[PDB]
Amino acid sequence: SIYTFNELVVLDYPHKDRALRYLERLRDDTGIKKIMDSHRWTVPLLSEMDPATLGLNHNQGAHIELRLRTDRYDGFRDYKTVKSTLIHQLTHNVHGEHDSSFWELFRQLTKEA
Ligand code: NI
């Protein structure tokens, strides 16, 4: 689809090859692809958030950041947690505040993904 992450950016820390594979896997994730296609979400930039809040959504999906690392050397967060954080950030494309409606949608997107 056009409803993907157009550009991936990782940071200059040890094992940056692994960081990039992390973002590529999230982008190629069947559940993530399905929900972005269904909801017509293009995210121009998916970037790694610096180590040392596990994600941010800037201006309704113009730029999403994900903290992949637990430290500055080789500690990475588990895919399961990062994936849920991405869905969290995507949920922010509709609901900015963590209110009743946010949790409904987040549960819905999680279900579909
Ligand atoms: Ni949030």
Which experimental technique did the depositors report for determining this structure? X-ray
Could you tell me the end-to-end alpha-carbon distance of the chain, in angstroms, rounded to an integer?
16
> % helix / strand / coil in the chain, to the nearest 5?
40, 20, 35
Strands (DSSP E) contained in 1-113 are 5-9, 43-49, 55-58, 63-67
Q: How much distance in Å is there from the Cα of 84 to the middle of ligand 1?
A: 11
Q: How much distance in Å is there from the Cα of 85 to the middle of ligand 1?
A: 8
Question: Where do the domains of the chain lie?
Answer: 1-113
Q: How much distance in Å is there from the Cα of 72 to the middle of ligand 1?
A: 23
**Resolution value, angstrom units:** 1.8
Site of tokens 């040392």 = 52
- Residue 78's CB is within 10 A of a number of other CB atoms, namely 9
Local structure of residue 42 (DSSP, 8 states): -
Long-range contacts of 64-69 (CB under 8 A, 24+ apart): 64/5, 64/89, 64/90, 66/23, 66/26, 68/10, 68/19, 68/22, 68/23, 69/13, 69/19
Q: How much distance in Å is there from the Cα of 11 to the middle of ligand 1?
A: 22
